[PDB]
Amino acid sequence: YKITEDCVSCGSCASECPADAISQGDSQFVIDPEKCIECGNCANVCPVGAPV
Amino acid sequence: EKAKSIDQATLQLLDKAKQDGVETVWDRKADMKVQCGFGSAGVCCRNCSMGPCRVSPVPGKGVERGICGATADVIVSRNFARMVAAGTAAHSDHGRSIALSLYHTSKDGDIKVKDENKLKEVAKSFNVETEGRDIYDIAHDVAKEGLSNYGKQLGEVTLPPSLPEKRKELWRKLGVYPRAVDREIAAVMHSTHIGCNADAEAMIKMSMRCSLTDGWMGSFMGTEFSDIMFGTPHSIDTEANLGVLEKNSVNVVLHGHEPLLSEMVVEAASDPELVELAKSVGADGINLCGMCCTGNEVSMRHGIKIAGNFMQQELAVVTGAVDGLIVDVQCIMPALAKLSKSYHTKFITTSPKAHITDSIYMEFDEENPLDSAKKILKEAILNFKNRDQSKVMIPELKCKAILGYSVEEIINKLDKVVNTQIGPMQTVKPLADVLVSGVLRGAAAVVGCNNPKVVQDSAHIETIKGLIKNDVIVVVTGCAAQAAAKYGLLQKEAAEKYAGPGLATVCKLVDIPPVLHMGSCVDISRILDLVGRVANLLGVDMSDLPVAGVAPEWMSEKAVAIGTYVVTSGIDTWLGVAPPVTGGPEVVDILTNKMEDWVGAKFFIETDPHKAVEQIVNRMNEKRKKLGI
Amino acid sequence: KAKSIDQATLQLLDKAKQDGVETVWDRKADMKVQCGFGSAGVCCRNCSMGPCRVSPVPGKGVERGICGATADVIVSRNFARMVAAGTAAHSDHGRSIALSLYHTSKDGDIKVKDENKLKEVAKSFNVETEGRDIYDIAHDVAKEGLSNYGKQLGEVTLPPSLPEKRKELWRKLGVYPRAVDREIAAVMHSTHIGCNADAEAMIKMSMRCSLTDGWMGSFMGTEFSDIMFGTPHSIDTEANLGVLEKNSVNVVLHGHEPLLSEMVVEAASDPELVELAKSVGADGINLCGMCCTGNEVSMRHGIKIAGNFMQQELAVVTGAVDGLIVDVQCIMPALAKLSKSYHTKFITTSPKAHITDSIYMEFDEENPLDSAKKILKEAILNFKNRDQSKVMIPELKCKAILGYSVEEIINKLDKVVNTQIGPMQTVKPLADVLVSGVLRGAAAVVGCNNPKVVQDSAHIETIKGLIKNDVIVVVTGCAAQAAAKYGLLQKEAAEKYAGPGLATVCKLVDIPPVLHMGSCVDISRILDLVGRVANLLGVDMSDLPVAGVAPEWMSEKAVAIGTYVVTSGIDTWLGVAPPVTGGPEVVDILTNKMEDWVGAKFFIETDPHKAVEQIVNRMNEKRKKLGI
Amino acid sequence: MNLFQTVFTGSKQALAAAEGIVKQAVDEKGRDYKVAFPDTAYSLPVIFAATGKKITNVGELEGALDIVRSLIVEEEMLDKLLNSGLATAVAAEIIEAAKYVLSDAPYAEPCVGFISDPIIRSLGVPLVTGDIPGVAVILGECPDSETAAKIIKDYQSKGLLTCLVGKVIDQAIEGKVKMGLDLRVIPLGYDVTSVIHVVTIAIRAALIFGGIKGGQLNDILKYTAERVPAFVNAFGPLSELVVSAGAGAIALGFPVLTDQVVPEVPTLLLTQKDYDKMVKTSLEARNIKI
Amino acid sequence: MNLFQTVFTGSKQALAAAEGIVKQAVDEKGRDYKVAFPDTAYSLPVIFAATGKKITNVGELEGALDIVRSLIVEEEMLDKLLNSGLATAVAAEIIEAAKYVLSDAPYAEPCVGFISDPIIRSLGVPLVTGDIPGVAVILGECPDSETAAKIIKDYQSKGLLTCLVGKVIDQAIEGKVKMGLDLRVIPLGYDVTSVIHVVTIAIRAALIFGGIKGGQLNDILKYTAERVPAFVNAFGPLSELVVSAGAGAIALGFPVLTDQVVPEVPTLLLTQKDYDKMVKTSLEARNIKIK
Ligand code: SF4
Ligand code: SF4
Numbered sequence A: 001y002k003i004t005e006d007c008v009s010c011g012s013c014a015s016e017c018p019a020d021a022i023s024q025g026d027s028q029f030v031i032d033p034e035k036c037i038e039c040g041n042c043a044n045v046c047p048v049g050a051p052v
Numbered sequence B: 001e002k003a004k005s006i007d008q009a010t011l012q013l014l015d016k017a018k019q020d021g022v023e024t025v026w027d028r029k030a031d032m033k034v035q036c037g038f039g040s041a042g043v044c045c046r047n048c049s050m051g052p053c054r055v056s057p058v059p060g061k062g063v064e065r066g067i068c069g070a071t072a073d074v075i076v077s078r079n080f081a082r083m084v085a086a087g088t089a090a091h092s093d094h095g096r097s098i099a100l101s102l103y104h105t106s107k108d109g110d111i112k113v114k115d116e117n118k119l120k121e122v123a124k125s126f127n128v129e130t131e132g133r134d135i136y137d138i139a140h141d142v143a144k145e146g147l148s149n150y151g152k153q154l155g156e157v158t159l160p161p162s163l164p165e166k167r168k169e170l171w172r173k174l175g176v177y178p179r180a181v182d183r184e185i186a187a188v189m190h191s192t193h194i195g196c197n198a199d200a201e202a203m204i205k206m207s208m209r210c211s212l213t214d215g216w217m218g219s220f221m222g223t224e225f226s227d228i229m230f231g232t233p234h235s236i237d238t239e240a241n242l243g244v245l246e247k248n249s250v251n252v253v254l255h256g257h258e259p260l261l262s263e264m265v266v267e268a269a270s271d272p273e274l275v276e277l278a279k280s281v282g283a284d285g286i287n288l289c290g291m292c293c294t295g296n297e298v299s300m301r302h303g304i305k306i307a308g309n310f311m312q313q314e315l316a317v318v319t320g321a322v323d324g325l326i327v328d329v330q331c332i333m334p335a336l337a338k339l340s341k342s343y344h345t346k347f348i349t350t351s352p353k354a355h356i357t358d359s360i361y362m363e364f365d366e367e368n369p370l371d372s373a374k375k376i377l378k379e380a381i382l383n384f385k386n387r388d389q390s391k392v393m394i395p396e397l398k399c400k401a402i403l404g405y406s407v408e409e410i411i412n413k414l415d416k417v418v419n420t421q422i423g424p425m426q427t428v429k430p431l432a433d434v435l436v437s438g439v440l441r442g443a444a445a446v447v448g449c450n451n452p453k454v455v456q457d458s459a460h461i462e463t464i465k466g467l468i469k470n471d472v473i474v475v476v477t478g479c480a481a482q483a484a485a486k487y488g489l490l491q492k493e494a495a496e497k498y499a500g501p502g503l504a505t506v507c508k509l510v511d512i513p514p515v516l517h518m519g520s521c522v523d524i525s526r527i528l529d530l531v532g533r534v535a536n537l538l539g540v541d542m543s544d545l546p547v548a549g550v551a552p553e554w555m556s557e558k559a560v561a562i563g564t565y566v567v568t569s570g571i572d573t574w575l576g577v578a579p580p581v582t583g584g585p586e587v588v589d590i591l592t593n594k595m596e597d598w599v600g601a602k603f604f605i606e607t608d609p610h611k612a613v614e615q616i617v618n619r620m621n622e623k624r625k626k627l628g629i
Numbered sequence C: 001k002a003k004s005i006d007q008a009t010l011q012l013l014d015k016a017k018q019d020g021v022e023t024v025w026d027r028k029a030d031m032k033v034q035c036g037f038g039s040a041g042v043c044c045r046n047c048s049m050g051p052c053r054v055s056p057v058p059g060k061g062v063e064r065g066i067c068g069a070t071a072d073v074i075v076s077r078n079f080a081r082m083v084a085a086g087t088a089a090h091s092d093h094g095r096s097i098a099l100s101l102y103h104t105s106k107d108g109d110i111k112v113k114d115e116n117k118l119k120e121v122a123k124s125f126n127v128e129t130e131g132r133d134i135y136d137i138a139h140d141v142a143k144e145g146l147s148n149y150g151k152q153l154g155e156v157t158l159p160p161s162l163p164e165k166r167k168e169l170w171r172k173l174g175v176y177p178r179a180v181d182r183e184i185a186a187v188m189h190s191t192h193i194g195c196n197a198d199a200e201a202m203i204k205m206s207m208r209c210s211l212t213d214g215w216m217g218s219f220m221g222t223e224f225s226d227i228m229f230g231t232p233h234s235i236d237t238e239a240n241l242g243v244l245e246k247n248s249v250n251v252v253l254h255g256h257e258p259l260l261s262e263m264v265v266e267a268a269s270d271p272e273l274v275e276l277a278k279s280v281g282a283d284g285i286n287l288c289g290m291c292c293t294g295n296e297v298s299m300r301h302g303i304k305i306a307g308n309f310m311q312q313e314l315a316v317v318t319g320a321v322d323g324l325i326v327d328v329q330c331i332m333p334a335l336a337k338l339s340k341s342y343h344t345k346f347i348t349t350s351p352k353a354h355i356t357d358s359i360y361m362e363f364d365e366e367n368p369l370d371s372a373k374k375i376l377k378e379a380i381l382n383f384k385n386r387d388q389s390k391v392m393i394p395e396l397k398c399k400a401i402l403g404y405s406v407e408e409i410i411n412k413l414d415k416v417v418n419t420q421i422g423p424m425q426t427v428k429p430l431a432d433v434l435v436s437g438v439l440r441g442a443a444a445v446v447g448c449n450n451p452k453v454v455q456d457s458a459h460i461e462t463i464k465g466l467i468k469n470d471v472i473v474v475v476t477g478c479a480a481q482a483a484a485k486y487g488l489l490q491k492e493a494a495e496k497y498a499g500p501g502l503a504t505v506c507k508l509v510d511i512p513p514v515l516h517m518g519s520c521v522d523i524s525r526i527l528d529l530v531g532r533v534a535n536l537l538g539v540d541m542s543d544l545p546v547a548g549v550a551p552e553w554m555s556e557k558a559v560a561i562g563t564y565v566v567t568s569g570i571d572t573w574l575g576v577a578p579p580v581t582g583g584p585e586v587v588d589i590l591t592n593k594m595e596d597w598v599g600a601k602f603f604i605e606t607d608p609h610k611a612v613e614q615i616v617n618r619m620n621e622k623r624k625k626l627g628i
Numbered sequence D: 001m002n003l004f005q006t007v008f009t010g011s012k013q014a015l016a017a018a019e020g021i022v023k024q025a026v027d028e029k030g031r032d033y034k035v036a037f038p039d040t041a042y043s044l045p046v047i048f049a050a051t052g053k054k055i056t057n058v059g060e061l062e063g064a065l066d067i068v069r070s071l072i073v074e075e076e077m078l079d080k081l082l083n084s085g086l087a088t089a090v091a092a093e094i095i096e097a098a099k100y101v102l103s104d105a106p107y108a109e110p111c112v113g114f115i116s117d118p119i120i121r122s123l124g125v126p127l128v129t130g131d132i133p134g135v136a137v138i139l140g141e142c143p144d145s146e147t148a149a150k151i152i153k154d155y156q157s158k159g160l161l162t163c164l165v166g167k168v169i170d171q172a173i174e175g176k177v178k179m180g181l182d183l184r185v186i187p188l189g190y191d192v193t194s195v196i197h198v199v200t201i202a203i204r205a206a207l208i209f210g211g212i213k214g215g216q217l218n219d220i221l222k223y224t225a226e227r228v229p230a231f232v233n234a235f236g237p238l239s240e241l242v243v244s245a246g247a248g249a250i251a252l253g254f255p256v257l258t259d260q261v262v263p264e265v266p267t268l269l270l271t272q273k274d275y276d277k278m279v280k281t282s283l284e285a286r287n288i289k290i
Numbered sequence E: 001m002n003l004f005q006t007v008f009t010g011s012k013q014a015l016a017a018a019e020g021i022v023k024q025a026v027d028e029k030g031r032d033y034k035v036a037f038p039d040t041a042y043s044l045p046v047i048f049a050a051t052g053k054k055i056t057n058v059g060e061l062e063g064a065l066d067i068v069r070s071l072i073v074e075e076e077m078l079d080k081l082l083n084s085g086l087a088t089a090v091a092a093e094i095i096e097a098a099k100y101v102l103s104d105a106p107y108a109e110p111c112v113g114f115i116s117d118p119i120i121r122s123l124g125v126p127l128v129t130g131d132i133p134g135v136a137v138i139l140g141e142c143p144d145s146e147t148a149a150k151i152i153k154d155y156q157s158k159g160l161l162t163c164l165v166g167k168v169i170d171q172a173i174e175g176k177v178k179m180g181l182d183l184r185v186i187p188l189g190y191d192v193t194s195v196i197h198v199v200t201i202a203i204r205a206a207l208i209f210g211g212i213k214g215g216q217l218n219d220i221l222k223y224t225a226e227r228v229p230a231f232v233n234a235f236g237p238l239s240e241l242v243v244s245a246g247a248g249a250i251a252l253g254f255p256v257l258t259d260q261v262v263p264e265v266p267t268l269l270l271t272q273k274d275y276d277k278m279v280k281t282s283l284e285a286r287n288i289k290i291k
């Protein structure tokens, strides 16, 4: 899963992430590909649908 | 998935709303999806433009402090205090309007004095002379004293005589003794400003101090002045739920909180010209129905039918039969403005305090209340010609209810079980006797709103039924009272259907339902009054009594202020919806543990109604064992 | 980016890094990307059905909250609550001052020091003065001022400098102020769930509330403070963190309430306390002020100013602050934590502003002098715990001139009045230079710091640009303190930065190009000044070439200030965007439609040079409208 | 000790006394020895009404203690309090039956003890007619003999059938109160349990006049509450056993009035210190018209 | 029309008149014809002071119009207003120089026109010693002859040197004011441009007594502002040209007093309607003390 610039940094995906791959960065939250279990729960928990 | 309501009429209208392609509060709640965790825990702050700041709801992990250095406890406590201040402001503005109306009463005017004995007793409570005086001079002096309670900067405020001396002394020692209402709201708003108060205990104490000006001054004065001007409620029959709407009559629904407008609309509905106009537009007559607290007021004083509580307001329009929807202030979903576009309904705002975009604004003129109400009602009546009867669906579901149980009415009912050779009459002594003997285990107040987070009316009904089954007499206000009315608990027959043995015996002896509707949200002051009298009769503080308050499905800031002042008065309060405080461990500990050391009561957070009933019974029993009864 | 333009600030930030302590800059960095919904103002938490967040972009995503409230409604309610909070802070300050005035006596700790000012104020409040005891007059004036806060019947009392045209415009618009606490309560009521869901009405209610701050709360606080503690006059002082002394006890006064700082200043001259400071091995007592309380004591006594808002932590980082005494407002709670890393005694004194893990010594207003003396004695005794090896005071201090109240400005203007023409003791020379075009206009620079902006950069750049364009600048609060640190509060600055017309005016009147008019409540003075000018020219305040700027604001008080300045008819530039971008209707109201209501509007501009250009263009437009 | 705990303690004391006296009867006379009341057709009326069983021998009397045990559930709800009062009534009846089987003549004049069925039938005609508008059950001791005599003779002059339990009998004798069935002043006995001898008057009134069959306990209680105009005037200090017996009277729908400070229950348990108004207070509480 | 626009308009009108009269001089005398003022070593003093250039022929007089053009920048800042006032002063000097070119004696008595250098040296010593407390530049017209005579003789009785421009010359004659160099009442001319003849007195005072070389304009303006106690009393309605010339007087540090409603500038441009206090107002405005 990969996050996009559409992210407004609401922090919902970060915590919801089972594997905790998602971390806050310089301009938006980011997804670590190596530890992402491809569940897609972050996409579900997003008011703007940034995680793709 | 989860059911939206336990009420069948609500479910039928939700199916109709789905068929009509209109959105409801349930649909918007679904669209909101997973709500923000930071805001839900109360660890988000936006009090200055250095922010927004969010700190971790879990201590020891993540970001600990806001930019200014404020901890999670500070952010949570300030957010809670601002909720209390907002609720206090709403109630105090309602009471201030009532006092100003009292100040403008006259013998030949639209607003008169209808209960002179109540006014004389209130004048006694305000140190206003009455003997050999004109009634309206007394009314104006009482109104002046009440208004001074709101904004006096020197001296002490005036509190009702039912408040025990011990409770006042405890407040003074704790530092929460109330000042003028607007002054306390301003104090809370000042101390939550960036770089002011960063100590959770002091913040909670300031919020308690502010809430006291609501419970014992604002709501109390509003209730008593409303009784003076519009009559003290007495036991009266009415009908509840959406079935009260008439297909063949003009349907005028009064929504909101301020009672002067609804009183004037009720008076205008009997005007011969308006009745003739309703006949001429092709209707059988005028059918006034009330919703939420204004519906509670007009129903307590005149038996006006109650159409429904908070989360039913939209569904009232969904019937397609509401020709006019007249709203003043508070708990008026703005979505109504959009929703009324899909029907013929005139959505009429009347208060400069509550403008709603795309609604029809007809300012209610307090200088000429009756003429202004007649004009608004004439607009509603004339809209009946735009009714589309093919879109009308009114569920055949309505329920008989009995209400009007003011403290005076309760005392009058209790006089029935007083032996004349013993006495005394006109006291709360029979209630104190049944509580002390253990025939009644206690008294519980069920108050509050609906909330989409809870199956609508489910928690209210389950809590009330559990309490009365455990021989706890229940007094209800607001949307909880209206849920009880719709369900059928506000009936004498309910005593033998739901109550336990002791409460059933008490209901049979006193000839009352097991659930007593004491009025609107401001009428929660009546409950305080009642408890205070009982305490004053037993020579104890209100925290020594087996009493409790429950808010199973609360949503509003007013509910937060109510729970805060109920706990501060010494009455344990159960909340069926978690307030946004879980992010601050210190605030949770203060509200649920340390408050008992301060004021002898505390908050209980319990989302399971059956568990809440069990906890309430256990707490009442332990307070009884402390008291020796 | 750079953390500040001030070199002393930078040296102390390096020291704080070496000491392992965190600052406001570090916490701002830790916050990282702040929430977009809250930044745009489209998040709502006004009821427990929420939290609700709607899309800041119309036509996309979630449009309404659960109750049905739109983005414009959510934005407008959030803005109104910010205004109500700022109004509450200022009104509580003024209420404390009015109560102190009510408790004045001839032989008490709090006296009347300016009887002429009291008599003029009594005239403004319809209080008789002829053949009356001065303290009876003071008590009557205090009673009238207190009634302004909570009267439920009748009209409030407003200063005579407010033009009649502005009052009539307010009455027609429906924003004419009521009692201050009543207006705060009204704003809080109408933002409750299910009340006001119309942005225009919400903004008008917020303007109505802010008027009770600008013209009643702050105004009464300022005038009663002048009555009790003296009207400010031209006075010299020193600014920036270099004013701290290594070999003396250093007592730093932080906050806003002036009575405590006045009593501390008086106590510092007590012979017993001076002897005690000598006995603990110190050369003496060095009082330094920060933020608005520092501004007050500096305007009235020349107390050195240690620094403005975002420098407070760095004052402790020096290791030389023996006692930091705080009353209320803009007191970073992190100070308590920071005080653990040094010997500093962090003393809270007000029941309104408890701070966890600070030393609480409640300031007793019944015996203000003795209470101040015991607090100061605690600060002095802490000098024995000083660790001189941890002390680093940058050798960076700057001379400043302040004390420019309206009365002082009028006294200075009297010099350029021809005796054979007159009149004396008016604002007429200032009106003349403005009308003739020698001065293009007057601009008020106010507001806080904000980590979002390089600290003091926007203040200094805006002020220098304005004075270069022959716009005379009046400064208050942390902006005024930034000007003091930089060196703009100097007569020499006139020939170094000002344009030709302003340099000539400064030479003729013998004033700096930048006039420090006091604390944030003293912004009322600015209103007073502008009002007088308007009343002298027979026009409304919206016809004048005047403006207000808040280059680096952070507080809710700043929001209320900008709102009442715009409502009074003065265009306001904001150097930090307020959380309103999510509501297009609210943006349109604040920046476009407001001009139709009150003749002024907000300008949002984060580039100071562009802000200066826009201010000059707008002033020229208003001059062309006025014919000057 | 609150009202519920007082009633439970009294019921337990009554059960203990019943167990002791039944053990004594078993030791002296044997479990086959006959158990009966003089000239009755309902065996032990309270047990017969509660369960329908007729107690005929001492072994059955010992087995009747299980009824008392099962009627005592120590939970603070009104139904349990009424059941505990009924347990006290059953225990008192068992004690009286054991007294009758132990001694040939348990009661010596002026005490009459058990009231036979023919007396009940004789009193039934003036009961329903209205010549007897109520039954005044006076228990305990008044502060003086004069006040006891005054109250008793006020009830007598109003036509009420007054029954006396305890030291009030001696006070009335000192007060020159003329006693007898025709004079409507019946001394039952000096012990508290003797009050059961008027309770069985009401119970059998439901069995004879009402026609309710044995074992229909709720019907019997309803009949006593709505048809038998009985009330209790408890004078002097009240022990837990007296309060439990009063709870039994309340379970039969008979209000209890006392001059002592008690946890009052409206229309059921009332305190009246003024001895000059006790008669009127009782007539109002029992809704009796003279 | 605000103060800045009034001054710019006046300067443009002064430039227009200068261009027209220079064209007449070129057409009648040619660009080789000599241009000079009677008995002076500073050529045209204002141009020599501002630029250091001496103008000798008509062709250079035509080339001096570019100085006026370069001094008029229509931007509403104080420095541009002062430069535009100096533009009016240069244009007025060009007009007066062309007057001497076109007509051999352009001024008829009582008007004296240009003031020669020996006269300046004659009255320079009293200017330094304070025997002449100040220079009263009176131009325009008073409401009546007696008002002008009263003010002029009030200045004369105090020892001030008063110069007259415009209809006040005739009003003073009707008021019987004795005019002369020894009487310190000098009528310059009936046209507004004749006020340049007292301006060059202050300019050459810097050149002769201050020892400032030509082209050092800022030093000369500083000298006239501190050393020459001159002031302007403008009576009667004021055209844009009069206001722009007053801006020229202000550029030299000379305050302008008037009885007309104007956009007053403190210490520089003042309105005094009371003719009974105009002398005292001017003395205070110019810091003049009479011993
Ligand atoms: S939920 Fe969406 S908007 Fe929020 S932080 Fe994650 S990607 Fe960004
Ligand atoms: S797909 Fe699942 S594991 Fe991967 S980032 Fe999203 S929530 Fe985390």
Ligand code: SF4
Pocket: B045, B046, B047, B048, B049, B050, B051, B052, B053, B065, B066, B067, B068, B069, B070, B075, B193, B194, B195
């Ligand atoms: S008050 Fe503090 S925590 Fe709240 S937004 Fe401002 S800096 Fe952040």
Ligand code: SF4
Pocket: A010, B036, B037, B038, B039, B040, B044, B045, B052, B054, C035, C036, C037, C038, C039, C043, C044, C051, C053
């Ligand atoms: S509660 Fe705070 S973090 Fe959550 S959406 Fe709202 S502003 Fe953003």
Ligand code: SF4
Pocket: C044, C045, C046, C047, C048, C049, C050, C051, C052, C064, C065, C066, C067, C068, C069, C074, C192, C193, C194
């Ligand atoms: S007031 Fe409306 S938008 Fe705000 S939290 Fe409540 S439901 Fe959501």
